[PDB]
Design brief:
Structural class of chain B: alpha+beta
Subcellular location (chain B): Cytoplasm; Nucleus
Number of strands of chain B: 3
Strand order of the largest sheet of chain B: 1-2-3
Strand content of chain B: 5-15%
CATH architecture of chain B: Orthogonal Bundle
Largest interface: A-B, 5 and 12 residues
Distance between the termini of chain A: 13 Å
Number of helices of chain A: 0
Distance between the termini of chain B: 16 Å
Oligomer: heterodimer
Structural class of chain A: mainly beta
Radius of gyration of chain A: 5 Å
Bound molecules: zinc ion
CATH topology of chain B: Inhibitor Of Apoptosis Protein (2mihbC-IAP-1), Chain A
Family (chain B): Belongs to the IAP family.
Strand content of chain A: over 45%
Protein name (chain B): E3 ubiquitin-protein ligase XIAP
Organism (chain B): Homo sapiens (Human)
Chain lengths: 5, 79
């Protein structure tokens, strides 16, 4: 999974 | 400070959010909710009620707890 904001 | 989304503190409220969750994601709502994540209703994008961290592009093999921990090391929920 890719973290993002 | 302290919790980002108190309305998603309940595991039942996180589970309830996973309506229209895509079949392509390969991670279940129950795994995601147990790791403190709830559904935003967009793609496979989820967010943590505690740290506010957001996670997307889940891949087969990912573990909800491990991905949450690794990318959000300050999160008190998966510490
Ligand atoms: Zn978190």
């Amino acid at each position: 999974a890719f973290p993002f904001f | 400070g302290h919790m980002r989304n108190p309305a998603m503190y309940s595991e039942e409220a996180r589970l309830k959010s996973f309506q229209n969750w895509p079949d392509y994601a390969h991670l279940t709502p129950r795994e995601l909710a147990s790791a403190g994540l709830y559904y935003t209703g967009i793609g496979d994008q989820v967010q943590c009620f505690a740290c506010g961290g957001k996670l997307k592009n889940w891949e087969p093999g990912d573990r909800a707890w491990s991905e949450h921990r690794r990318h959000f090391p300050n999160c008190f929920f998966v510490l």
